[PDB]
Design a protein around this ligand. Structure first.
Ligand code: SF4
Ligand code: SF4
Ligand code: SF4
Ligand code: SF4
Ligand SMILES: [Fe+3]
Ligand SMILES: [Fe+3]
Ligand SMILES: [Fe+3]
Ligand SMILES: [Fe+3]
Ligand code: NA
Ligand code: NA
Ligand code: NA
Ligand code: NA
Ligand code: NA
Ligand code: NA
Ligand code: NA
Ligand code: NA
Lengths: 500, 502, 500, 501
């Protein structure tokens, strides 16, 4: 079993994954300065469970063990809320994407979905999945959730693409398992993971049956190639000096995972051709994940903190407009938080026994996350001033000629250390333009689906026929009232009482 | 005991309150067409408790009775959440302000505050207050919450006003009780209430001791005058015909309550000179009330439904831009709901036993409420079209010459009854410009305090120093870290891992 | 000739238009308290021309006379700008819709359109139109612009409606002229006008030929019935007392115009069957009218003033948040102003000699008008406080017992007259919820087309192919560059120089 | 005389400016890959003037020469509008900050300000300034506008700082000129300029008289040290390969200018102790420069085009939500343009003869600029998809094994070259997170002052008392009407009926 962050880091050494970064094979990711910040972030998920056991670990009814909360199958609405509390804490502690939420949300969504496949088909995907959960809980591993394919022409489904590999598919089968080819793009923390769960990314039709595959692969499976994603300001991490990085210790990681006839044994296959359940899996995965964006409220707390610090250093902490902007940042940030925890608080039990958060409220959390981080970032930049983008390099600050000039001229209020003022400005740059903006801004935009995806799911659940009848009642319209034909689950949850 | 909405309406008859409306004494408010819709709204709070007992009634540990949820002192976070579920449901059912939330929030806030006054002062305000709760629970009454005074010069406190009566104060005392003078403005449902609880509206200093008065008065108390507030489109109610009203059955009510040496016996006095607790009472009342604005999400549901209906009648229900606007309305509306129910879900036990919702999240609920109704209304008007403001009167629709012309020319898609298209347009007008916009828009703006009041309360709780230290840690700043000196309660609630006393 | 406002009001007396309001024919609109505010607003357009001749009157090349600017066919970009300056002034002076812009914009758009019909068809519409212009310039009359039909099913065109009358059409022809039936809805100031110009409201196909009719009718034409539109708080005008009206002197007017076989002689027909020019007329009318919404910036000025006045009366004029809100109101209001005048400044000469403002910039003006008045309103309500909607009636203020109580208890800061505080609150109510909100809010929303209409026009002129090529150039993309196939007029205006 | 952009590039060679970048003196900025894109942007200001003479060149009444429009003292409202037309075109052509506007706005503002100093004090700053304009017009030079000092404690003015050098000041004088010390921060294109005009940045009181200094210095003046500013993704320029840069040919430049006893001869001094005119100079400089932000609408045009291109490549160009977002971007961008050109169109003649644009409308232009680029960028990222931030490097694309995998898997619709999809994504990254976002976003925010600065200037001109009286009139309030005590100039311009007097 992995126990500490240090144990986790050790577990990543000597694995010989095939990883391309800047046209070179990376022999040891743990030692690569661009990659190590992402690993440190994951390590903190282990360290928090040691320092704050009630927050970051759970009693598993599946294994009868205390497990890391990222590997816990939620047994109550309270367990869902605890995920959110842990996520905000980790965002405060790291200021970045700590990567492990995807696999948590994947596992929780698989628990219920596998149960339902088996109920219809008489298969044993749920039994297979539970044995997997027991293993990863006992060993305390990091699990990637690999849903999003490259997708090719966005207007066409899998079976209509010119190249069938643009969504991940079964290419062959034998007595011992399946072989899959394809790719998964934008994969958070995959190189830092022990196992990756491949999942379909779209509703599938009967024509798309070969793409109805879910399966768990070890990170070091044969036939996998990882091609690392660049980030804004990525190579600052490779430069000597830590100031210009802004957040030197922590960062995120994305890569493209290429699959060439990768083998998955039957015991790790959780869906095989049951195309009509792809949409259920995507729906439930995105239901959880869309309110895991509570994590971004911890980032928000850090960015607010940074804005308040630079205002202090600049000698204008208590001016009205700055105080007002800091309030606005806080308000926006808490609006996201409220939506996410409301979703979790409103969760309900699924047939398999796992709790699922409220889907509608999850869409609201995520939809606001697509908007507000951009505004929080803009207001931070206002408060910081122009030096947030014109500051000289640390190499210049350390220079014998340029350095004293910078120490003199980049003074803020008397008594503030210029190096501290530099460091806080670089943190702001990092979160609004640089490496951690990838997560704070663009992942807020696209993670668990682009804005339009949330709108379509709100549309599905927003009970417009029910609402029409409310309005007709009040307007005294009686003669054209129609029975709603729509999903009616949301108001059943909103108005749930002990009498149903 | 009042059981039904009909019983409630009968309890309002024959009371001879002194009520001025349009320069006339109103002899029987129940029979006045401008007032009756607000009565109907309150009656629905009784009817809902009969139809949906688990939603709208509660088991009181105070009395051991099943009580209307508006009279219940919340015993759990679940109880707070149920207040919100009830609120949204009543909003859906009435499309208006149903008035009784203010008294519920007042009672909940007084339960904890009176306990704490007594703890310090050795008084028996809490005992008095519980006897009051028992009475109103047994009798199933409507309670007004009368906090906001007229206030005069906004830049000055009570003792600095030119006229001391511009905030409500004690003017005399005797062996049996106190006598108060002043006024309470903007008072929701006061004429429709059985009792009204007077409460200070602002932090009080020692110089403001005379204004540190909380007391319950019967609505028919001697020395009270009510001066009714106008509303946008108020007088449509008094015209024959119901179409132009939009929502003819339900509305809200506000009045100015004047107090001239009104007597309050000791048993109904819940604060008497302990000025240092005024800020506690206001804080806690506003904490509850700022997330009672979940009620406005039920009104949002109605408005969304009206916009979808007119789109249907117009022949364009499925056009992209309209669908996208209805999604937006829904998203903004649910954002408010989420904030309010999160506040309630995150509630904590007070010393007296009552649960208080999360103050920070209440601020967020209300602050959003100050913004989003205005946008939902704008979008509704876009979807409706120009006829929302140019539609001819019902008297023209019923006219032998004009009426057939309107039935011909105001057609929507084939098969839609023109009267139904007119009715839905009037509903939209009513909620965005007319009588129900008073509540949906302007009370969203000012109820439980104007926007700036929320911003100041967010500021008080937003833990800037804590957050500065988070940022310093990540930036590698170590040599100027300061211990925060600020309220730290919010993050204690946010990161609370279990429900414990130790 | 009409010269003064008083002359204009006299011109309206004794006409016996058939006007239904509240199920009764109105005997004398000039004396009806609900109608007279709208008449007063139009009278101000005459009085302004006497007080401020350079602003509100123009030298007409067509008649060789000084004419009211509302009747002037623009001869330069300066003439378009002067329209806007006059509009804002009139908004400041009346705080309402003063009605006469529609006819101005109709006439300017007909001047160019008629010329183009004739260029193609060899007809005499432009010559007819110019004789009409000469007459109304000499007589100094008020002209309604009656474009918008009731429209029936919004998803169907004229020839597809279940009732052909739902758009206005020719129903018969004589040796002397045409006969039209139909209706025009939401008609600004029509009962207050001398002449009304009927115009088609949509693109017409060949099947819609019967609906290709433009003609001028006198307001007292046989076969016309007017049905007056309600407004929020309309009947306050009919109550004794002026306080509760907010703006007692001025207001707007809409009515539904019903046409039953109304005769139009040939000399007043400016389009007869040339369906392919309907789109041109609608485009050019809306081009002008979309930036006539500068008028709403004068209303904004009044509402800002009212907000600042109530802050003063409340004793908090200089508090930071109120100052900031006032600034925001000002910024939004000026953004609308700027878009309007930029459109006008960028105008270009048409074949007929009239100048047309920049259509793209007009769209931007209007689109911002659909948004910002709602925000300005919201902020005014914030500043005013709750009394803006809970204030007792004037009848209570004048009562011998209730009145003294109101004088005492509705005090603001010392020295402020309570009646003045009541008055300013009622003005705010009037402009944000009551009669003048119809114009300020809902007419901002729908006048010259609902928001979507402006979006479609921006789309038509936004030169996406040109922009794609800009980006491809800078990205170093060379091998898939396509020639744009789109209207290219906007950037020709943006970059216009003496060299073309 | 410099004619072409090539001539301009050659003029920059061999000057030996002291420039620190990454802890080294830069030997030849023209050949440094981080610096050359900024140079290329300035070169395009010369090339445009050759290609499009009427747009980018002007007939100067000062010299009687045809001059680059960046060196032209505006003689009409039309000349102000032409500045904005040129700005938007340059933004379209470069997608970056092309640097030369700041000098233009500085020179326009100094023209009127020097005249007024002399009118009061009997000095010859205006005559000196005109000789300077003649020189730079004849030689066709690039002029920096160096106003913003580092400023120290933002709550304190110059004479109150702990270190007097935190705002630039005169430290000595002699028979031939003044000597100045201090620094100027965030200086656009300064290393790419021939001359730099130093100007005070704040209202000055009598105690601040030593800081009341305006003067022109050659970029190669003795006692000057430049310290280059970093930019998001700066070092991509220094890597082999051009794809990951997004916009490889063009970028911006900002440096800290350190002044150590720099000599300015009298003929290049345009203010010397007349502290009461600092406010005037700042106001007028910011008046012009706040609507020079029309430049950002040309950048908006590029970003819109990039968003439309990626939608095409992805196979969803005509989906309603994407079309609607494109429309929104266009609307916000045009709103900025309209405010700027309205300001220009509404310009008025100053005492010296130069035209000044409408200050109120400039504030509105700039204030919208502080908001809308951020939304345009957000929408572009929505349309692009996740690859805008997860795309592998060009070195991976060119790798013999990884490259073919990327060519296969990063396909868009059939027929789209994957290299072109990569390139357009990098352009979007460059403009929203990388090197050109410095200008598009953060300079939109702070250039010519932070948002609060615009709010205070709107407040000064918004004629609240006048508006209160409008509302009083309509409400029927007659007995407490007060005469406004405020600047009344804006509505004088709004309601001006003719071009007179
Ligand atoms: S983006 Fe945030 S929610 Fe998603 S995996 Fe990263 S830390 Fe967790
Ligand atoms: S406004 Fe809403 S929350 Fe307030 S009392 Fe009325 S119904 Fe309840
Ligand atoms: S709404 Fe404005 S632009 Fe339209 S007619 Fe009325 S005053 Fe003129
Ligand atoms: S940021 Fe734009 S306006 Fe400013 S100098 Fe650069 S190109 Fe010109
Ligand atoms: Fe995510
Ligand atoms: Fe309220
Ligand atoms: Fe209009
Ligand atoms: Fe700038
Ligand atoms: Na490093
Ligand atoms: Na580094
Ligand atoms: Na009635
Ligand atoms: Na009625
Ligand atoms: Na009247
Ligand atoms: Na009246
Ligand atoms: Na390079
Ligand atoms: Na490069």
């Amino acid at each position: 079993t992995i126990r500490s962050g240090d144990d986790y880091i050790e577990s990543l050494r000597g694995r010989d994954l095939k990883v391309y970064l800047f046209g070179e094979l990376v022999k040891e990711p743990v030692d690569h300065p661009m990659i190590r910040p992402s690993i440190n972030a994951v390590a903190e998920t282990y360290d928090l469970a040691l320092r704050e056991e009630a927050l970051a670990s759970a009693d598993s009814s599946i294994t009868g063990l205390k497990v890391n909360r990222f590997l816990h199958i939620a047994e109550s609405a309270e367990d869902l809320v605890l995920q959110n509390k842990m996520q905000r804490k980790l965002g405060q502690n790291t200021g970045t994407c700590f990567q492990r939420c995807v696999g948590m949300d994947a596992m929780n969504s698989l628990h219920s979905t596998t149960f339902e496949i088996d109920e219809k088909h008489g298969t044993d995907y749920h039994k297979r999945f539970l044995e997997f959960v027991k293993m990863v809980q006992q060993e305390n591993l990091v699990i990637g959730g690999a849903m999003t394919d490259p997708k090719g022409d966005r207007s066409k489904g899998p079976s209509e693409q010119d190249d069938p590999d643009l969504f991940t598919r079964i290419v062959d089968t034998d007595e011992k398992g399946v072989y899959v080819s394809g790719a998964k793009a934008h994969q958070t923390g995959c190189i830092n993971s022990h196992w990756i769960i491949l999942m379909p990314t779209i509703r599938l039709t009967e024509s798309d049956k070969d793409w109805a595959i879910v399966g768990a692969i070890p990170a070091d499976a044969k036939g996998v190639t990882y091609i690392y994603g660049r980030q804004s300001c990525d190579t600052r991490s490779m430069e000597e000096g830590d100031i210009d990085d802004g957040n030197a210790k922590f960062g995120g990681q994305e890569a493209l995972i290429i699959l060439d006839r990768v083998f998955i044994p039957w015991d790790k296959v959780f869906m095989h051709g049951e195309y009509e359940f792809a949409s259920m899996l995507v729906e439930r995965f995105t239901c959880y994940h869309r309110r895991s964006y509570v994590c971004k409220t911890g980032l928000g707390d850090v960015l607010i903190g940074a804005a308040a610090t630079i205002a202090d250093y600049n000698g204008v902490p208590k001016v009205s407009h700055i105080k007002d902007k800091i309030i606005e940042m806080t308000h926006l940030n808490e609006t996201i938080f409220a939506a996410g925890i409301a979703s979790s608080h409103q969760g309900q039990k699924m047939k398999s026994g796992v709790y699922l958060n409220d889907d509608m409220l999850a869409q609201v959390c995520k939809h606001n996350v697509t908007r507000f981080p951009y505004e929080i970032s803009r207001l931070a930049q206002d408060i910081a001033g122009g030096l947030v983008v014109t500051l000289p390099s640390e190499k210049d600050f350390r220079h014998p000629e340029a350095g004293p000039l910078l120490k003199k001229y980049l003074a803020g209020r008397k008594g503030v250390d210029v190096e501290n003022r530099m460091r806080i400005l670089r943190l702001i740059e990092n979160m609004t333009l640089g490496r951690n903006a990838v997560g704070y801004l663009t992942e807020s935009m696209h993670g668990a689906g682009s804005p339009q995806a949330q709108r379509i799911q709100i549309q599905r659940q927003m009970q417009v026929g029910y609402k029409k009848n409310l309005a007709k009642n009040l307007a005294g319209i009686t003669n054209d009232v129609e029975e709603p034909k729509e999903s009616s689950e949301y108001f059943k949850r909103v108005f749930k009482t002990k009498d149903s």
